[PDB]
Design a protein around this ligand. Structure first.
Ligand SMILES: Nc1nc2c(ncn2[C@@H]2O[C@H](COP(=O)(O)OP(=O)(O)OP(=O)(O)OC[C@H]3O[C@@H](n4cnc5c(=O)[nH]c(N)nc54)[C@H](O)[C@@H]3O)[C@@H](O)[C@H]2O)c(=O)[nH]1
Ligand SMILES: C[S@@+](CC[C@H](N)C(=O)[O-])C[C@H]1O[C@@H](n2cnc3c(N)ncnc32)[C@H](O)[C@@H]1O
Length: 261
């Protein structure tokens, strides 16, 4: 019914070569060569990012969609790309990252980029069931892809519901993955959240064309339906005319060392 739903149905119809060409068409990618080299080598003294995911938060932060300040919570931190990014930022006082890190899920990677000493990771932590805590900046990058649109809807709704559960009165800043934003139930939920909390939704250019993921953020106000439909139309247009070529950008590099505050 929605254009996003049309997009999702059509993505599954793509043969191998068409899918591979499509997913990278006109997207932005960070060059992960240096980071992969030092990660393989096992170095902790080079200011690399532990994941490709750090590129997404850098973009959101630098483009002004998200202030990162105070006590930061990183829900579903995985390797910790968003946690280390946050820890290096001027106004950040501490970062707490929670993740499952069990049964095939990514474990936090120990690194010594700026502010590593103000980061605390806990694995074996299910953010859907564990007790909440206050934060000034609440990050959540959770949303596992599925070819079943109903599974993506359910996963998205659980993330948005858990976000409202964790969000405290002092949580003025936030960034939450919205895996499948086009689903009418998800649009409705986002609209309700926006009534209470403000903010808006944005497509991060580092996302592959094979996902409709968008981020619900605190730093900009916009029209949810319009922003979602604009991304759906963009994804559909890229499908009709796939370039098969990504724009390459420099990776997220950080200083190394401890911080006092
Ligand atoms: N290994 C690795 N790669 C990273 C990373 N970051 C970016 N990449 C970049 O991702 C590319 C491969 O795509 P990836 O395997 O990571 O996931 P893709 O988008 O294929 O698929 P996925 O996100 O897992 O699934 C999205 C949806 O696409 C659809 N889909 C997946 N595979 C296929 C397919 O084979 N055919 C069709 N028609 N649809 C598919 C399904 O609907 C699925 O729900 C890499 O070459 C690299 O440039 C990283 O941290 N690790
Ligand atoms: C997309 S990755 C996060 C990437 C991260 N932002 C980065 O830059 O490295 C999502 C992570 O959330 C974790 N996760 C999924 N469900 C979770 C849950 N219920 N509780 C805690 N972590 C969860 C997954 O294991 C995965 O490692």
């Amino acid at each position: 019914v929605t254009l996003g739903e049309v997009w999702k149905r059509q993505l599954n119809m793509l043969g191998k070569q068409e899918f591979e060409r499509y997913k990278v068409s006109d997207i932005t990618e960070v060059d992960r060569t240096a980071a992969r080299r030092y990660l393989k080598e096992g170095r902790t003294d080079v200011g690399i990012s532990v994941s490709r995911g750090a590129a997404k938060i850098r973009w959101l932060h630098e483009r002004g969609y998200l202030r990162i300040t105070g006590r930061v919570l990183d829900l579903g931190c995985g390797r910790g790309g968003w946690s280390y990014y946050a820890a290096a930022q001027k106004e950040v006082m501490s970062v707490k990252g929670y993740t499952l890190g069990i049964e095939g899920h990514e474990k936090p990677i120990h690194m010594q980029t700026l502010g590593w000493n103000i980061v605390k990771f806990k694995d074996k932590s299910n953010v859907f069931t564990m007790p909440t805590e206050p934060s000034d900046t609440l990050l959540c990058d959770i949303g596992e892809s599925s070819s079943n649109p109903l599974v993506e809807r359910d996963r998205t709704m659980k993330v948005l519901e858990n976000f409202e559960r964790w969000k405290h009165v002092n949580t003025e800043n936030f960034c939450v993955k919205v895996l499948a934003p086009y689903h009418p139930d998800v649009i409705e939920k986002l609209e309700r959240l926006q009534l209470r909390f403000g903010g808006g939704i944005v497509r991060v250019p580092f996302s592959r064309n094979s996902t409709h993921e968008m981020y619900y953020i605190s730093g900009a106000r916009n029209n949810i339906t319009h922003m979602v439909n604009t991304t759906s139309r963009s994804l559909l247009r890229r499908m009709t005319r796939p370039s098969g070529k990504a724009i390459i950008e420099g990776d997220v590099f950080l200083p190394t060392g401890t911080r006092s505050v």
